[PDB]
Every structure is written in structure tokens, then in C-alpha cells.
Design a binder for this molecule. Structure first.
Ligand SMILES: *[C@@H]1O[C@H](CO)[C@@H](O[C@@H]2O[C@H](CO)[C@@H](O[C@@H]3O[C@H](CO)[C@@H](O)[C@H](O[C@H]4O[C@H](CO)[C@@H](O)[C@H](O)[C@@H]4O)[C@@H]3O)[C@H](O)[C@H]2NC(C)=O)[C@H](O)[C@H]1NC(C)=O
Ligand SMILES: *[C@@H]1O[C@H](CO[C@@H]2O[C@@H](C)[C@@H](O)[C@@H](O)[C@@H]2O)[C@@H](O[C@@H]2O[C@H](CO)[C@@H](O)[C@H](O)[C@H]2NC(C)=O)[C@H](O)[C@H]1NC(C)=O
Ligand SMILES: *[C@@H]1O[C@H](CO[C@@H]2O[C@@H](C)[C@@H](O)[C@@H](O)[C@@H]2O)[C@@H](O)[C@H](O)[C@H]1NC(C)=O
Ligand SMILES: Nc1ncnc2c1ncn2[C@@H]1O[C@H](COP(=O)(O)O)[C@@H](O)[C@H]1O
Ligand SMILES: *[C@@H]1O[C@H](CO)[C@@H](O)[C@H](O)[C@H]1NC(C)=O
Ligand SMILES: *[C@@H]1O[C@H](CO)[C@@H](O)[C@H](O)[C@H]1NC(C)=O
Ligand SMILES: *[C@@H]1O[C@H](CO)[C@@H](O)[C@H](O)[C@H]1NC(C)=O
Ligand SMILES: [Ca+2]
Ligand SMILES: [Zn+2]
Ligand SMILES: [Zn+2]
Length: 777
């Protein structure tokens, strides 16, 4: 029986016959004693040679052992492990399934865009969007550096590419030690230094060898023992590329991944650490099927192709002559030439600033202006010679279900037998800091939003303090003469109609209860504004922008004068007001309403909406979207959801950094005026997850939110709808522009839901939720 003792020279498991065997040259992994004292053991050693119960055969059932002060944290990434693999194949992966059964797992973890390996691994350890950490793709150019970055080049090890602070520096700077067994960035002298221990990347290293060395670091003297370590394997990504995500080959690769994790857990058990180590097992992105039959070619759109293209699932286009022509390159002409060309194009071109704001993909010089958003399972490539089109790939929109990643966790810091809703991989950095009792460097995670995964949360979130309390808008006389140019000939007693805008204290409180049921937004921006109380809606009107910061109203389940009737608001000083004359006839902009007059009961109520403090400058083509949304879509939503609380308002993000900006920054205004033009309009729809309740009697833990950040564009070319005779394209357009409430807050400087009677950390979950339709549609 040589074979079962020729196995050691090629196997990592403690087979039945070799329990006690004689050490020779040379076994990769060693049974049996003296394996233990020599710390040479095959991970199964005790279950297989000592007849102990293996980790796997055990039941689910905070005891770190000798010299383990604080829980070590292990971050284990399996490249390309899509959330779907776990949902359908979990019984083919016994070790991961145990972990899933006994620990804490998410329904899925959302990656960042583009859904690429270096982008997402670096986001995981920094908590940063790619536009901030700087690794915006596996391939990129930087005109300031005038340097190219690639996965097969030594420029990638240049620290100038790598921004932010990876978790291994956060630990090291605060007195801990970090060891990485492969991780993008770990071989770079980021901020001038390396992890405490790190390995030179070698894709050929047996996964088993990677686990055994991670186990040895745990075996180190306490003085040198890492407190944080990473583990990385290339499967199921490698096989997924070659054969696609639905293939026998990928299942084989997933089982090989499953055994990798099995070896790790048995090794922890052996060392009595299984209930000591906190372990996070996750992935950088998912995997999707491609075909040489599903290719879009630039040659079909350009007679002449004088440009450089990053091809595939997340394309960009830039000048071929860089850096001379990097900026003069006409990205707008490229986008226009690619727009609405064939009835069923399988991609859509964008300037980066017009990309859905939820992608946070614009504010970096390396992010070429021309971006293509590609339909799932397709690729956009230069010409018909493109060759890398069989099997699988990734890169797409992080909303696609195939791009979702796994997230499983286990250890004393984590709840047991617990399943949490999906969350974003930007949240994981704060989580790891909490598990290592580290203070996080500034990042894009929302600290505390993942506290429901943890047994005793290390971080307790603080409410944001309002920076700008309201000012007073005083009731006053109609100016005489009235030089607004506004007209509303139907009004018979103007002083009486305007007294409806001057509510008694109990009417204010009633309006507050019905239309601001979660409290008024707090203003974190430095802004001068006042609150306008009305029966059906309340707003914060700001002289800084001559319009509301926000407008809020509640519509119940079940139930259109535009500028036939409009008048100045006597509570707003004229010099701080929009006028009807400000909207001169020769214009592409027309007044839009935040609280829609088509919702108020006919009669005196409707006059409360028809005032110059309830209007926002809208492109006519955007108004078309807006009016269809509030006249047709919104009532249908409200009937389906048993009422809706609606808060809406303008966004100005002219430096496209994803945040509100000082008012000096606005670069566009209504012609001949100083009425600023918003880049986006936000809408936040709140109802009850239990549709037997209304937005007003919902338990706070059961609120349902749907937010939109709608680009304020002068045409509807994004929807290919300017020649469209209907509005059935509006819903689809809005669906790709949903957003987290947290995105709205960042862009507006507003803070919502301050009055909810639940823990702040629960409200943070609500605010980080991303509404997604695309996998339902
Ligand atoms: C995601 O999270 C990251 C991390 O917090 C965050 O990146 C940060 O962005 C802010 C603002 O956009 C940056 O603020 C800068 O701070 C630096 C520090 O070096 C200063 O150099 C800058 O000062 C300028 O702005 C002043 C405005 O008052 C000007 O007066 C002055 O003239 C300067 O031009 C600037 O304030 C911050 O540096 C980064 N941090 C990192 C590490 O990158 C990002 O904004 C978050 N993204 C989203 C969408 O929320
Ligand atoms: C703001 O006005 C510009 C310019 O308006 C044109 O020039 C002005 C001096 C005045 O004479 C107007 O009557 C002219 O139309 C607008 O830019 C125009 O855009 C339209 C497309 O919508 C186009 O047909 C014209 O060529 C453009 N004019 C020029 C000279 O560029 C701009 O659209 C206006 N924006 C707003 C807020 O409506
Ligand atoms: C929806 O709610 C119904 C009413 O239950 C009562 O109100 C809800 C909001 C909860 O607070 C519950 O504690 C109350 O008893 C339920 O009967 C019904 O089951 C709920 N629907 C679902 C799917 O749970
Ligand atoms: N730490 C690393 N250093 C260098 N290259 C890496 C590292 N980790 C992964 N890779 C490579 O990146 C590939 C994944 O890229 P992709 O399939 O394009 O997402 C892997 O198959 C490896 O070839
Ligand atoms: C970067 O690569 C491009 C090709 O995409 C090349 O034209 C350019 O000269 C390169 N620049 C440097 C500094 O290597
Ligand atoms: C770089 O390292 C220095 C020295 O520890 C530290 O003060 C600084 O915060 C680090 N910067 C970043 C971006 O991590
Ligand atoms: C990479 O690892 C393989 C497999 O262990 C080994 O054969 C090879 O020597 C390593 N390559 C380098 C360049 O170190
Ligand atoms: Ca901004
Ligand atoms: Zn990857
Ligand atoms: Zn890949």
C-alpha cells in the first residue's frame, strides 16, 4: 500500500493508515505525533488519527485560549464567489454551509463598481469607494502621473496609485500586528509601509499551503502573533471565467474552495480557537455568463475608431494620444455618437457625472469621462476580432444579482444562527475595526449600521447635530404694486387665501404629525432657511437657493393648474424669492412644483400649493418625467403601499464628489437670474413593510423606503425618449436611479428620521438600504 503512504507527498490530509507514521523527506503536511509538538499536523489530524469529532461533524453550540487576550480576526476572500452559488449549492459545500448554519450570514454582500478584483478587495479593507481610494479598475491611466496601471505590470506596486488606509495599517498604527496571505495592495508600500507580515503574490501556491501558514501565524509567540490576517484564493473566479457560472467545473472549484475553508476550521478547532477567532468569509464580486454571440462592437457605431477603449463589462473610452490630448478629447461627442443608435443597444453610454449617483463613480481623474454601462451577459468591445468572449466575466453594475458576493461570519464577536439582510462591502472596514477595537480612518461605511451582526457592538453611533437651526419667515403684506409678474385671476379674496398659509399652532402641529411623521430633517449644511407650514405639506425654504431645501407631505391610500394660477408667497421677502417674471418665455426651463398641486383638494386647498416658494426650476424635458411620475406613478405606488410619506428637493453637486457643496460652487443658473439649477432632484418615499399599516402607524423597525436621485437633464436621451410618444420609459429610467437615503443625505446635507423611536443603529440600516428593481425586472 504505497499509495496511501505515497499520498503525503501529494496530499494535505492525515489518512487513516498514516496515524503515527514515520517522518520522511518530504511530506507537505504531517501526521501523526510527533506532528503536534512540531506543529506539522495535517488539519484533520485529531479527527482522523486521535478519533476526536471533526469541526464539520459537530453541532453549532467566547473562549479564546492561553495568551489570547483579544479575538484574532481572519478575513477570507474567495475570488468570484457569487451570492447565487451559496443560495443554490450550499449542500454541495458542507463546511461553508455549517458556517452558514451556525454563524451570521447575509443574504448577499453588494460589491462596488466596477465589479473587479483589485477595485473590490481594496474597497473591502479601506471602506472607500473606488473614486476615493484610486483603484478604479484593474486597468487604468492617470494623466497627472502620466502612468498606466495593470494587473501584469510593476507599475501596480507603485504606492502613488493606492489611496486611503487599509485595515492592516489601521491595526499597525494602533499597536497591533497584521499578516496578509495575498491581498491586493499588501505588496505595496502604501503610506510608506507594508503589513507586519505579507507574502509575495504567487497564484500557484496550493490553497492548502496558504491555510497552513495562516494557522502557523496563530501558532506564533504572542509577541509576534498577528491580530489580523487575510487569506485569499482565486477560485471560484478562475474556473468561473473559463467555463461560466453555471458549469460542472465551477461546482468542482467551489468544492475545492469548500475544502480550503474546511481545513482552516479544523485547524482552528485543533488549536482550540474555533470559538476564539472571528472569521469573515466573503468575496470581491460575482460572476456572469458571456458569449461571443453577445458582443457590442464599437465598429458598428464609428466609421473611424480613433480612441483607446477599456473593453468588456465596464468599458471606458479615452484619447489614444495621452497625455497631450487627454482633456481636449471630446468625450461628449463620443457619448452622443453612441447614444440611441440601434433600437436594442446592449449598453448605454454616459459621461461619468451623469452615471447613477448610487455608483459614486465620477470624482477621480483616472475615471475617464466616457463610461459604458453594459447589459448583463454582454460585452462592449472595439472590433469583431475580440477573443475573450466565452465562459464568464464580471465588471457590471453592482446591482445585478450575478455581481453580488457572499458574506459569512463566525466567531465570538458574531451572533449565532443569524441571517441578516444584504449590505454593502463598504461597511466591512468599520466592522473589522470594531472587531479589533480599532478606531477607523475616515471612510464611506456608516459606522454602527452593521451592529445587528455583532454580539456586543464595540461602537455605538451618535446622532448628527444640526448645524443650521431654522430662521423665521414672517407673514406680511402683499407688495404694492406686485411686480412679480405672477397671475391668479381665480382668487376672489387674496388676504383670505393667504391666511391659509399662516396656521394656528394646533394646525401646525397637526401638519407636523401628518406630513413629518419621522421628524423634520436636520440641516448639517450651513444654510439660511425657514420652515413653511401648510395643511398638506411642509417645507424648509432657503434664501441661499431661492427655493426649498426639502418639501414633505403624506398621501393616503387612494384619492393641474400650472401657471394659469401662481402668486408670490407673502412670508418670503421679495429679494429672496423666485418671480414669475424670472421665468421668461424664451426658456428651456419652466417652474416645477415640489408638493404637487394635483394632490390638493380642489378649492382653497389648491391655492396653498400655487405659490413661488413651492417651485423649482425644471428643464422642460425633465418636467415631463417629473409630471408623469407625480401624476401617474406616485398614486399607483401609494395605492400599492397603503399611503406614502414623500420628501423631495433639489441637489447641487456641481463638483460631482457625491456631497453637498458650498453655494459658491453652483455653476448653472436660470438665464439672466441667480436662481440656481439643481444637478439632481431627490425623492424619498416611506411606507410600511406591512402594508396593512400606513406610513403613520408603522412600527419604526418595519418602515419601507424607496429613494430616487434623479439627474436633472435638459433632454431624455438617456431614455432614448425625446422622439417617444408615450411615457412608459419613465419607470425604467427612475429604477436605475434609486439610491440609499444615506446618498441623499450626503448630497443634501440633510439628516432624516431623527424622531424614530428605535436604536440609532436600526435607523442606520434603513438609511443604507438600496432599493433594487433590476433583478425583479
Ligand atoms: C467617502 O469617504 C471619504 C473619506 O472620508 C471621503 O473622502 C474625503 O473627502 C473630503 C471632502 O470631499 C476630503 O476633504 C478634503 O480634506 C482634505 C485633507 O487633505 C483637504 O485637502 C481638502 O480641503 C479643501 O476643501 C476646503 C473646503 O472647505 C477648501 O477650503 C480648501 O481650499 C481645500 O481645497 C478637503 O476638505 C477628504 O480629504 C477626503 N478624504 C480622503 C481620505 O480621501 C469621501 O468624500 C466620501 N465620499 C462620499 C461620496 O461621501
Ligand atoms: C439660456 O440661453 C441660452 C442662449 O439663448 C440663446 O441666446 C440668448 C442670448 C438669447 O438670444 C436666446 O433667445 C437664444 O436662444 C440657451 O442656449 C440655447 O440652447 C438652445 C437649445 O435649447 C439652442 O437652440 C440655442 O442654440 C442655444 N443658444 C445659444 C446661443 O447657445 C440656453 O438653452 C438657455 N437656457 C435656459 C435656462 O433656458
Ligand atoms: C401585518 O400586521 C398585522 C397586524 O399585526 C399588528 O400590527 C403589526 C404591524 C404588528 O405590530 C403586530 O405586532 C400587531 O399584532 C399582522 O396580523 C400581520 O401578520 C402582519 N403581516 C405580516 C406579514 O407579518
Ligand atoms: N494580491 C495579488 N497580486 C497580484 N495579482 C493578483 C492578486 N490577487 C489576485 N491577483 C490576480 O487577479 C486575478 C483576478 O482578476 P479578475 O479575474 O480580472 O477579477 C487573479 O486570478 C490573479 O491573477
Ligand atoms: C500608457 O499606455 C498608453 C497605451 O494605452 C500609451 O500610449 C502611453 O504612452 C503610456 N504612457 C506611459 C507613461 O507609459
Ligand atoms: C500615513 O502614516 C502616518 C504615520 O503613521 C500616519 O500619521 C497617517 O495617518 C498615514 N496616512 C494615511 C493616509 O494612512
Ligand atoms: C510559485 O509557487 C509555485 C507552487 O508552489 C512554485 O513552484 C514556484 O516556485 C513559485 N514561483 C515563484 C516565482 O516563487
Ligand atoms: Ca459636491
Ligand atoms: Zn475578483
Ligand atoms: Zn475575475
Amino acid at each position: 500500500y504505497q499509495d496511501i503512504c505515497v499520498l503525503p507527498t501529494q496530499s494535505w490530509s492525515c489518512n487513516k493508515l498514516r496515524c503515527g507514521e514515520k517522518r520522511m523527506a518530504n511530506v507537505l503536511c504531517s501526521c501523526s505525533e510527533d506532528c503536534l509538538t512540531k506543529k506539522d499536523c495535517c488539519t484533520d489530524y485529531k479527527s482522523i488519527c486521535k478519533r476526536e469529532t471533526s469541526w464539520l461533524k459537530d453541532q453549532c453550540a467566547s473562549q479564546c485560549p492561553e495568551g489570547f487576550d483579544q479575538s484574532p480576526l481572519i478575513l477570507f476572500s474567495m475570488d468570484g464567489f457569487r451570492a447565487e452559488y451559496l443560495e443554490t449549492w450550499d449542500t454541495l459545500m458542507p463546511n461553508i454551509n455549517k458556517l452558514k448554519t451556525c454563524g451570521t450570514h447575509a443574504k448577499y454582500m453588494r460589491a462596488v463598481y466596477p465589479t473587479k478584483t483589485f477595485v473590490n478587495h481594496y474597497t473591502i479593507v479601506t471602506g472607500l469607494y473606488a473614486e476615493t481610494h484610486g483603484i478604479i479598475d484593474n486597468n487604468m491611466y492617470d494623466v497627472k502621473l502620466n502612468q498606466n496601471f495593470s494587473l501584469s505590470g510593476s507599475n501596480m506596486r507603485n504606492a502613488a496609485w493606492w489611496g486611503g488606509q487599509p485595515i492592516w495599517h489601521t491595526a499597525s498604527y494602533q499597536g497591533l500586528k497584521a499578516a496578509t496571505y495575498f491581498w491586493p495592495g499588501s505588496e505595496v508600500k502604501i503610506n510608506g509601509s507594508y503589513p507586519t507580515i505579507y507574502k509575495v503574490y504567487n497564484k500557484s501556491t496550493p490553497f492548502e499551503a496558504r491555510v497552513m501558514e495562516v494557522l502557523k501565524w496563530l501558532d506564533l509567540p504572542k509577541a509576534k502573533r498577528p491580530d489580523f490576517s487575510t487569506l485569499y484564493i482565486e477560485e471560484p473566479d478562475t474556473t468561473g471565467h473559463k467555463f461560466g457560472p453555471v458549469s460542472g467545473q465551477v461546482i468542482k472549484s467551489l468544492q475545492m474552495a469548500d475544502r480550503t475553508l474546511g481545513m482552516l476550521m479544523e485547524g482552528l478547532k485543533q488549536r482550540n480557537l474555533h470559538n476564539c477567532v472571528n472569521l469573515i468569509l466573503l468575496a470581491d464580486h460575482g460572476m456572469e455568463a458571456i458569449s461571443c454571440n453577445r458582443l457590442e462592437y464599437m465598429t458598428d457605431y464609428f466609421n473611424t475608431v480613433d480612441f483607446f477603449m477599456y473593453e468588456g463589462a465596464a468599458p471606458r473610452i479615452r484619447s489614444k494620444n495621452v497625455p497631450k490630448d487627454f482633456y481636449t478629447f471630446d468625450s461628449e461627442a463620443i457619448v452622443k455618437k453612441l447614444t440611441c443608435r440601434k433600437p436594442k443597444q446592449h449598453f448605454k453610454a454616459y459621461l461619468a457625472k451623469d452615471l447613477p449617483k448610487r455608483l459614486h463613480f465620477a470624482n477621480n481623474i483616472r475615471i475617464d469621462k466616457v463610461n459604458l454601462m453594459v447589459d448583463r451577459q454582454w460585452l462592449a468591445v472595439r472590433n469583431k476580432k475580440y477573443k475573450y468572449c466565452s465562459g464568464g466575466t464580471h465588471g457590471y453594475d453592482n446591482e445585478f444579482k450575478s455581481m453580488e458576493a457572499i458574506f459569512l461570519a463566525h466567531g465570538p464577536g458574531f451572533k449565532e444562527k443569524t441571517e441578516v439582510t444584504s449590505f454593502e462591502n463598504i461597511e466591512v472596514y468599520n466592522l473589522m475595526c470594531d472587531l479589533l477595537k480599532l478606531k477607523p480612518a475616515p471612510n464611506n461605511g456608516t459606522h454602527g449600521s452593521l451592529n445587528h451582526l455583532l454580539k456586543n457592538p464595540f461602537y455605538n453611533p451618535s446622532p448628527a447635530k444640526e448645524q443650521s437651526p431654522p430662521l423665521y419667515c414672517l407673514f406680511g403684506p402683499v407688495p404694492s404694486p406686485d411686480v412679480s409678474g405672477c397671475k391668479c385671476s381665480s382668487i376672489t379674496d387674496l388676504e383670505a387665501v393667504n391666511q391659509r398659509l399662516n396656521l394656528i399652532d394646533q394646525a401646525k402641529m397637526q401638519s407636523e404629525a401628518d406630513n413629518l411623521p419621522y421628524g423634520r430633517p436636520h440641516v448639517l449644511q450651513h444654510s439660511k432657511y425657514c420652515l413653511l407650514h401648510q395643511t398638506k405639506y411642509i417645507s424648509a425654504y432657503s434664501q441661499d437657493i431661492l427655493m426649498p431645501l426639502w418639501n414633505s407631505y403624506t398621501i393616503s391610500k387612494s384619492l393641474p393648474s400650472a401657471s394659469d394660477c401662481l402668486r408670490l408667497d407673502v412670508r418670503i421677502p421679495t429679494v429672496q424669492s423666485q418671480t414669475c417674471s424670472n421665468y421668461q418665455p424664451d426658456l428651456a426651463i419652466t417652474p416645477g412644483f415640489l408638493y404637487p398641486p394635483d394632490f390638493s383638494s380642489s378649492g382653497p386647498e389648491q391655492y396653498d400649493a400655487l405659490i413661488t416658494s413651492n417651485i423649482v426650476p425644471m428643464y422642460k424635458e425633465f418636467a415631463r418625467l417629473w409630471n408623469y411620475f407625480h401624476s401617474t406613478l406616485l398614486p399607483k405606488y401609494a395605492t400599492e403601499r397603503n399611503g406614502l410619506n414623500v420628501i423631495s428637493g433639489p441637489i447641487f453637486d456641481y463638483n460631482y464628489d457625491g456631497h453637498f457643496d458650498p453655494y459658491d460652487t453652483i455653476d448653472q443658473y436660470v438665464n439672466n437670474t441667480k436662481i440656481p439649477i439643481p444637478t439632481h432632484y431627490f425623492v424619498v418615499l416611506t411606507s410600511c413593510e406591512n402594508s396593512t399599516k400606513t406610513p403613520l402607524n408603522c412600527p419604526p423597525g418595519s418602515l419601507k423606503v424607496l429613494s430616487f436621485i434623479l439627474p436633472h437633464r435638459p433632454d431624455n436621451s438617456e431614455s432614448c425618449a425625446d422622439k417617444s410618444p408615450d411615457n412608459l420609459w419613465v419607470e425604467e429610467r427612475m429604477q436605475t436611479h434609486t439610491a440609499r437615503v444615506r446618498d441623499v443625505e450626503l448630497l443634501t446635507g440633510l439628516d432624516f428620521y431623527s424622531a424614530l423611536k428605535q436604536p440609532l443603529s436600526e435607523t442606520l440600516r434603513l438609511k443604507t438600504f438600496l432599493p433594487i428593481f433590476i433583478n425583479s425586472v
